[PDB]
Amino acid sequence: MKITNPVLKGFNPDPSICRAGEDYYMAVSTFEWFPGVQIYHSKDLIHWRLAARPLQKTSQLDMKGNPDSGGVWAPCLSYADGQFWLIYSDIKVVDGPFKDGHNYLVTADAVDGEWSDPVRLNSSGFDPSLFHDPSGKKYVLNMLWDHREKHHSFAGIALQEYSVSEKKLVGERKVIFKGTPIKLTQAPHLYYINDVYYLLTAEGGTRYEHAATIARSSRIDGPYEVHPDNPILTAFHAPSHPLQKCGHASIVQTHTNEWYLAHLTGRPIHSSKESIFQQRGWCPLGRETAIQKLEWKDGWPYVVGGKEGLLEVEAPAMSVKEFSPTYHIVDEFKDSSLNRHFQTLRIPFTDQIGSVTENPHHLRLYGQESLTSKFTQAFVARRWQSFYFEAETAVSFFPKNFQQAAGLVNYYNTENWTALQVTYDDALGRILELSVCENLAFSQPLIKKIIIPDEIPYVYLKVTVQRETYTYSYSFDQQEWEKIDVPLESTHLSDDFIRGGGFFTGAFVGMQCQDTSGERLPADFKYFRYEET
Amino acid sequence: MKITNPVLKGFNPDPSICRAGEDYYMAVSTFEWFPGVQIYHSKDLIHWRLAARPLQKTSQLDMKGNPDSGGVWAPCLSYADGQFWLIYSDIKVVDGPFKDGHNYLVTADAVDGEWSDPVRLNSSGFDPSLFHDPSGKKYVLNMLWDHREKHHSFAGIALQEYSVSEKKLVGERKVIFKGTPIKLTQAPHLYYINDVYYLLTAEGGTRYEHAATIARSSRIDGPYEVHPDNPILTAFHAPSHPLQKCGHASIVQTHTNEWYLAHLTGRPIHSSKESIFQQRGWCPLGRETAIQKLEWKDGWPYVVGGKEGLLEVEAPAMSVKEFSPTYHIVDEFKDSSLNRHFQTLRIPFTDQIGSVTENPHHLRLYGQESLTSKFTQAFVARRWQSFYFEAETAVSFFPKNFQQAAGLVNYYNTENWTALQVTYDDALGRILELSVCENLAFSQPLIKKIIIPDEIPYVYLKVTVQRETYTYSYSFDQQEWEKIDVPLESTHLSDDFIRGGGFFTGAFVGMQCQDTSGERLPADFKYFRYEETTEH
Ligand SMILES: O[C@@H]1[C@@H](O)[C@H](O[C@@H]2CO[C@@H](O)[C@H](O)[C@H]2O)OC[C@H]1O
Ligand SMILES: O[C@@H]1[C@@H](O)[C@H](O[C@@H]2CO[C@@H](O)[C@H](O)[C@H]2O)OC[C@H]1O
């Protein structure tokens, strides 16, 4: 009867909420993880099921070589004229003065149906949004990226008409809003409400200064006046609040004439050696999606409970409906294709990297490139979505040289991961090795190599995650586990720990095989258990 | 007449020398520059002409997104059984514990003919090489990359048989050599000389500790005995020597029964307010190729003149054969094909970025991504090949917003370049802007903006390179020039300045257009001049 935030747990940022009659959908960004964009469905705003992942083919999304946290940034999902519209980006440069990336449009009739081939829109900035103006005309909003040395990089909100018949942006482009002193003006969404235009934006950047700003105007092109108690959403001032980084919002008006606001947020683990006011913490689950309720006064919306958001939010006047779980707690790969919660890095899942059919009821992975490669990785993984869980798998892998390895991986990006892999030692045979990579600093800490007897058909591998730490354990028969006494830090796989300009995903766990010799040696995984506790 | 080194000036590393009858060929690496591999041709070893660039299709080489100084590393060109064999690499990771990359083989009847589609070989290490054993067997050598924490990454030289009929490696591989205390053992090339196997390698890394070591064995798989005066080539001990980084060599026996050694080298610019011992210099021309004469004693080759290598080298007993230049000093773009000294970053030249046929007598570049992008840049460039030159172009470009810019660029990688571009300012109209990117730190130092009047159809742009410094200048009438008073440092476009694990190319100059608004706004370049000051 209450909305319990985050409604989308783990890596699920930049929520774009829309209503198709009485059905509610939210699209979230996926960056380098393939297939692109996740769409969730809900009938009550409390329970959400993973319904679709539109960008399924390289003709829609080609991300081989994309930088970490490049690819699909904030998307925009809308419904109008009997079809869904998805505006998405493919960001190619995430560091330095430029942010080279391109905005595209695909359409579909059903969210889980077949999506069109993309139409080129523009490249002038990220967070593109498609606004269906009451007049029938259509408009694309985005932030304007300004590379010039002396200018703040977030130059404001651009507006330009989209011609449906010509399938291109037309007319003149106009900057309609420059933002507030919070700056980093971002995430524009336009709304026609009571004959006036409301421009919702994000400001402050997506770390702990994040905020949602709103302004209004009589004309679509402004000038816009800013909310008198702006920002309407932020946790910048409340470091102990359990919801942090609260911004990048979208508004929905329900079919019950109620008002709600979806936004991203982070749930940080804290230091204890440090003050939370100075060290705001680390978010291994990345940026998650939460929903707040809005109330109106004098033509201005307000977040009920205050600007920081609540964990428990007043659900709308609608019939509750839960959904069946969309993954197996223990997946034995008996299904025809990979479950919808598994994703690959950058490229589609094809025989290049593995198969679910070649060895039935197994996931076969052909050894390809290492975990530091932005190109071709034989790696299938799924999100951390709880601070407390166990993941476990069983691998048949018989490597012949030290350049072959396969096993269980916990992963943030190409420079930040840990891996417990079956590999080969030329003087010891098959061994089990722990490899740790922290901002490209690589170590293999076990001084005592773990030998695997030759006739063990399956090495059982398991990770136990307990909030701020996690540990690996292994078994040669499943009913007898041995724990590796190296406590790994969960905070080292978080938005707030990794270096670089792209820090936008979250921790993953999955099965991986690599063969840097060229032989493409396969690794057979009998099952994958993901059990939150 | 002597051989004058370097024989290939500017960015021309990892020479693989090769002989077909009385014709000599040398392949060099090209990294992210497309098309891949440069093959030069010679009949006297003194004069070399740019003859072919084999890897022209995305089916042979797909480098979109490749890191700076990834892509085509050291190649191997050989001639046997009436055809050419090219072994090349595509490196995808250049930083950190791994070096993910793949080695391929392609063949052709002539170097400037159509090359085959690639056969996969292995992925175990770079510097792959094909050996043609007198028994008719074929073998692939390459270094072995060890990623493990406690091990030196250069784990020795691997050897494995290649089956021509099965189009794949067969049998087991074996490490046949582990190097000397110089380590970083790489660049393996096998030679069968009077019933003895000689294994040539590079050691020391490609900076100032570079060396060429050689060893011999009665059997192909070792054990190998190292040269008694090893290494046979290096300038590590001679900081003042005009050739530095001397290593990564290959040997050829001429049809005159003489022996020569092709190797890479750097010609550094030195600061005479810095220790020549501590700071060995900066090479904006990258790694170039030189040739040394060999001489034998007791079954060991020695480099004539000492192991530092000579600047002037005794030529083989062959007739001089000079070649006419393969580029125009002023290229006016009247051909429907880009001159062979022009390259693009990572991808083919297609309508996606440019056209020489849409506006006749112009190079039209369609505005695409910035100079920091590893994907789709409308950028056509050619090597710095002298310390003294000027390059010049003329651009027709009418930008309508600040995200459109086109002009003349000096470039090393995506983090290191300068650019003089026609662009647009909301308050001032068309302006000429100087942009500087030093290891991704970005500046635009002109305080007073240069206003371009609306009546000006072409803006003329020039760079004048004078060894350690270069300067841009511009003109609205081709005859009256104004110098932009900020001296730029040529040493910042050098192997020795840029950060990261990939530092393997060299400085380029070329024409560029970017449009990060999305409109693909075209810029038309009327000509490109590149004129070396041979007087110096
Ligand atoms: O576009 C989305 C936003 O949530 C956010 O956008 C900005 C990207 O650059 C960062 O430096 C800013 O902090 C951030 O606000 O991140 C990317 C994507 O998730
Ligand atoms: O493969 C060629 C070699 O000349 C050289 O190989 C090594 C690559 O890693 C660097 O750290 C070493 O110094 C270098 O010797 O560079 C690449 C290519 O030119």
mmCIF file of C-alpha atoms in Angstrom, chain B residues 36-212:
data_model
loop_
_atom_site.group_PDB
_atom_site.id
_atom_site.type_symbol
_atom_site.label_atom_id
_atom_site.label_comp_id
_atom_site.label_asym_id
_atom_site.label_seq_id
_atom_site.Cartn_x
_atom_site.Cartn_y
_atom_site.Cartn_z
ATOM 1 C CA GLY B 36 47.243 -0.178 -42.478
ATOM 2 C CA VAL B 37 50.899 -1.089 -43.064
ATOM 3 C CA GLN B 38 53.174 0.923 -45.342
ATOM 4 C CA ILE B 39 55.334 -0.976 -47.828
ATOM 5 C CA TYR B 40 58.308 0.771 -49.413
ATOM 6 C CA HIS B 41 60.268 -0.473 -52.425
ATOM 7 C CA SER B 42 63.892 -0.092 -53.453
ATOM 8 C CA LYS B 43 66.398 -1.365 -55.976
ATOM 9 C CA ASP B 44 69.574 0.080 -54.407
ATOM 10 C CA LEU B 45 68.733 0.355 -50.646
ATOM 11 C CA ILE B 46 69.525 4.080 -50.928
ATOM 12 C CA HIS B 47 66.249 5.342 -52.414
ATOM 13 C CA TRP B 48 62.860 4.122 -51.204
ATOM 14 C CA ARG B 49 59.420 4.840 -52.643
ATOM 15 C CA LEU B 50 56.085 4.401 -50.886
ATOM 16 C CA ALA B 51 54.676 1.480 -52.866
ATOM 17 C CA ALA B 52 51.511 0.132 -51.211
ATOM 18 C CA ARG B 53 49.299 0.118 -48.126
ATOM 19 C CA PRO B 54 47.857 -3.404 -48.003
ATOM 20 C CA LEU B 55 45.144 -3.274 -45.310
ATOM 21 C CA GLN B 56 42.457 -1.225 -47.053
ATOM 22 C CA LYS B 57 39.170 -2.945 -46.136
ATOM 23 C CA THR B 58 37.362 -3.204 -42.813
ATOM 24 C CA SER B 59 37.354 -6.974 -43.428
ATOM 25 C CA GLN B 60 41.149 -6.862 -43.088
ATOM 26 C CA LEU B 61 41.386 -4.193 -40.364
ATOM 27 C CA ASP B 62 38.574 -2.779 -38.192
ATOM 28 C CA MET B 63 40.022 -0.217 -35.786
ATOM 29 C CA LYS B 64 37.001 1.887 -34.775
ATOM 30 C CA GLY B 65 37.440 2.680 -31.085
ATOM 31 C CA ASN B 66 41.007 1.335 -30.937
ATOM 32 C CA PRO B 67 43.155 3.046 -28.276
ATOM 33 C CA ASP B 68 45.839 5.512 -29.260
ATOM 34 C CA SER B 69 48.857 3.541 -30.524
ATOM 35 C CA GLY B 70 46.762 0.381 -30.675
ATOM 36 C CA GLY B 71 46.037 -1.309 -33.990
ATOM 37 C CA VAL B 72 48.810 -2.395 -36.366
ATOM 38 C CA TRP B 73 52.003 -2.949 -34.385
ATOM 39 C CA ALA B 74 55.184 -4.447 -35.848
ATOM 40 C CA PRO B 75 54.441 -6.294 -39.124
ATOM 41 C CA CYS B 76 56.381 -9.019 -40.977
ATOM 42 C CA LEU B 77 56.664 -9.042 -44.779
ATOM 43 C CA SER B 78 58.245 -12.018 -46.542
ATOM 44 C CA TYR B 79 58.458 -13.441 -50.057
ATOM 45 C CA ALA B 80 58.363 -17.192 -50.604
ATOM 46 C CA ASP B 81 56.765 -19.665 -53.019
ATOM 47 C CA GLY B 82 56.090 -16.918 -55.548
ATOM 48 C CA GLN B 83 53.958 -14.673 -53.327
ATOM 49 C CA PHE B 84 54.179 -12.148 -50.505
ATOM 50 C CA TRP B 85 53.213 -12.982 -46.922
ATOM 51 C CA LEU B 86 52.194 -10.253 -44.465
ATOM 52 C CA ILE B 87 51.849 -11.014 -40.759
ATOM 53 C CA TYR B 88 50.245 -8.151 -38.848
ATOM 54 C CA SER B 89 48.611 -7.446 -35.501
ATOM 55 C CA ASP B 90 45.580 -5.546 -34.242
ATOM 56 C CA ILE B 91 46.215 -4.479 -30.634
ATOM 57 C CA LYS B 92 43.102 -3.624 -28.618
ATOM 58 C CA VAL B 93 44.645 -2.944 -25.173
ATOM 59 C CA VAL B 94 47.824 -0.930 -24.624
ATOM 60 C CA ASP B 95 47.659 -0.155 -20.883
ATOM 61 C CA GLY B 96 47.660 -2.305 -17.766
ATOM 62 C CA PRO B 97 48.360 -5.976 -17.059
ATOM 63 C CA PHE B 98 47.121 -7.320 -20.424
ATOM 64 C CA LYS B 99 47.851 -6.522 -24.067
ATOM 65 C CA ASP B 100 44.803 -7.977 -25.838
ATOM 66 C CA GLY B 101 45.537 -8.281 -29.540
ATOM 67 C CA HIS B 102 45.312 -10.619 -32.493
ATOM 68 C CA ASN B 103 47.765 -11.697 -35.193
ATOM 69 C CA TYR B 104 46.759 -12.310 -38.812
ATOM 70 C CA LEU B 105 48.198 -13.477 -42.132
ATOM 71 C CA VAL B 106 47.372 -12.117 -45.587
ATOM 72 C CA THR B 107 48.971 -12.857 -48.958
ATOM 73 C CA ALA B 108 49.237 -11.342 -52.434
ATOM 74 C CA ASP B 109 51.071 -11.781 -55.724
ATOM 75 C CA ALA B 110 52.409 -8.201 -55.622
ATOM 76 C CA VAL B 111 52.632 -5.714 -52.764
ATOM 77 C CA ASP B 112 50.466 -3.168 -54.615
ATOM 78 C CA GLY B 113 47.916 -5.787 -55.704
ATOM 79 C CA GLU B 114 44.815 -6.969 -53.896
ATOM 80 C CA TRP B 115 45.689 -8.684 -50.615
ATOM 81 C CA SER B 116 43.750 -11.670 -49.317
ATOM 82 C CA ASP B 117 41.346 -11.687 -46.402
ATOM 83 C CA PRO B 118 43.023 -12.508 -43.078
ATOM 84 C CA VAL B 119 43.656 -15.921 -41.569
ATOM 85 C CA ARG B 120 43.747 -15.978 -37.772
ATOM 86 C CA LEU B 121 47.039 -17.132 -36.244
ATOM 87 C CA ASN B 122 47.108 -16.591 -32.461
ATOM 88 C CA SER B 123 46.622 -13.939 -29.771
ATOM 89 C CA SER B 124 49.480 -14.837 -27.402
ATOM 90 C CA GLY B 125 51.755 -11.847 -28.040
ATOM 91 C CA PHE B 126 52.763 -9.214 -30.536
ATOM 92 C CA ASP B 127 55.614 -8.911 -33.066
ATOM 93 C CA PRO B 128 54.459 -11.978 -35.039
ATOM 94 C CA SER B 129 56.793 -13.276 -37.723
ATOM 95 C CA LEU B 130 56.609 -15.950 -40.428
ATOM 96 C CA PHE B 131 59.670 -18.150 -41.012
ATOM 97 C CA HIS B 132 60.140 -20.127 -44.252
ATOM 98 C CA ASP B 133 62.214 -23.138 -43.233
ATOM 99 C CA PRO B 134 64.327 -24.749 -46.007
ATOM 100 C CA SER B 135 62.410 -28.012 -45.451
ATOM 101 C CA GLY B 136 59.286 -26.246 -46.752
ATOM 102 C CA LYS B 137 57.705 -26.087 -43.302
ATOM 103 C CA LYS B 138 56.315 -22.764 -42.078
ATOM 104 C CA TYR B 139 56.586 -21.391 -38.540
ATOM 105 C CA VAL B 140 55.103 -18.387 -36.732
ATOM 106 C CA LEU B 141 57.197 -16.657 -34.075
ATOM 107 C CA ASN B 142 56.006 -14.000 -31.652
ATOM 108 C CA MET B 143 56.796 -12.720 -28.201
ATOM 109 C CA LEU B 144 54.843 -14.207 -25.299
ATOM 110 C CA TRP B 145 52.935 -11.794 -23.070
ATOM 111 C CA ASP B 146 52.752 -12.809 -19.397
ATOM 112 C CA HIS B 147 50.125 -10.797 -17.519
ATOM 113 C CA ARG B 148 50.722 -12.440 -14.133
ATOM 114 C CA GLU B 149 51.675 -10.131 -11.284
ATOM 115 C CA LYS B 150 55.022 -11.635 -10.296
ATOM 116 C CA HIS B 151 56.373 -12.228 -13.830
ATOM 117 C CA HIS B 152 58.167 -9.996 -16.288
ATOM 118 C CA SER B 153 55.618 -9.405 -19.037
ATOM 119 C CA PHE B 154 57.988 -10.377 -21.877
ATOM 120 C CA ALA B 155 58.068 -14.130 -21.239
ATOM 121 C CA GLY B 156 60.263 -15.093 -24.206
ATOM 122 C CA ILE B 157 59.904 -16.036 -27.860
ATOM 123 C CA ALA B 158 57.226 -18.561 -28.841
ATOM 124 C CA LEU B 159 57.497 -20.820 -31.903
ATOM 125 C CA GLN B 160 54.745 -22.840 -33.583
ATOM 126 C CA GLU B 161 54.318 -24.518 -36.962
ATOM 127 C CA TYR B 162 51.939 -22.943 -39.472
ATOM 128 C CA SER B 163 50.191 -25.328 -41.875
ATOM 129 C CA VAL B 164 49.592 -23.653 -45.241
ATOM 130 C CA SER B 165 47.011 -26.263 -46.268
ATOM 131 C CA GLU B 166 44.975 -26.135 -43.037
ATOM 132 C CA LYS B 167 45.357 -22.319 -42.761
ATOM 133 C CA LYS B 168 46.127 -22.454 -39.038
ATOM 134 C CA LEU B 169 48.814 -23.132 -36.474
ATOM 135 C CA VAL B 170 49.306 -26.812 -35.642
ATOM 136 C CA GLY B 171 51.081 -28.890 -33.050
ATOM 137 C CA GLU B 172 52.387 -27.395 -29.841
ATOM 138 C CA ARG B 173 54.120 -24.084 -29.292
ATOM 139 C CA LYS B 174 57.414 -23.892 -27.427
ATOM 140 C CA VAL B 175 59.374 -21.026 -25.908
ATOM 141 C CA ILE B 176 62.744 -21.215 -27.668
ATOM 142 C CA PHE B 177 64.553 -18.202 -26.173
ATOM 143 C CA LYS B 178 64.262 -16.116 -23.012
ATOM 144 C CA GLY B 179 66.547 -13.176 -23.754
ATOM 145 C CA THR B 180 69.456 -11.521 -21.994
ATOM 146 C CA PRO B 181 69.455 -9.304 -18.850
ATOM 147 C CA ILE B 182 68.292 -6.446 -21.103
ATOM 148 C CA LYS B 183 64.897 -8.240 -21.175
ATOM 149 C CA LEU B 184 61.729 -7.004 -22.906
ATOM 150 C CA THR B 185 62.749 -9.588 -25.505
ATOM 151 C CA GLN B 186 60.595 -9.168 -28.615
ATOM 152 C CA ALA B 187 60.700 -8.746 -32.410
ATOM 153 C CA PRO B 188 61.705 -12.362 -33.229
ATOM 154 C CA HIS B 189 62.986 -13.108 -36.751
ATOM 155 C CA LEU B 190 64.506 -16.449 -37.777
ATOM 156 C CA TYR B 191 67.256 -16.830 -40.383
ATOM 157 C CA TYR B 192 68.848 -19.996 -41.791
ATOM 158 C CA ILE B 193 72.440 -19.126 -42.746
ATOM 159 C CA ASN B 194 74.778 -22.003 -43.728
ATOM 160 C CA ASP B 195 72.895 -24.706 -41.786
ATOM 161 C CA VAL B 196 72.647 -22.594 -38.599
ATOM 162 C CA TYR B 197 69.521 -20.976 -37.159
ATOM 163 C CA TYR B 198 70.029 -17.328 -36.192
ATOM 164 C CA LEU B 199 67.347 -15.732 -33.991
ATOM 165 C CA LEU B 200 67.266 -11.927 -34.046
ATOM 166 C CA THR B 201 65.333 -10.116 -31.310
ATOM 167 C CA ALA B 202 64.814 -6.654 -29.885
ATOM 168 C CA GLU B 203 65.428 -5.969 -26.210
ATOM 169 C CA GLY B 204 65.233 -3.063 -23.794
ATOM 170 C CA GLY B 205 61.943 -1.529 -24.894
ATOM 171 C CA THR B 206 61.555 1.012 -27.642
ATOM 172 C CA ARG B 207 62.742 4.030 -25.645
ATOM 173 C CA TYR B 208 66.416 4.839 -25.117
ATOM 174 C CA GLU B 209 67.415 1.355 -23.876
ATOM 175 C CA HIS B 210 66.456 -0.246 -27.224
ATOM 176 C CA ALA B 211 68.847 -2.892 -28.531
ATOM 177 C CA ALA B 212 69.092 -5.584 -31.188
#
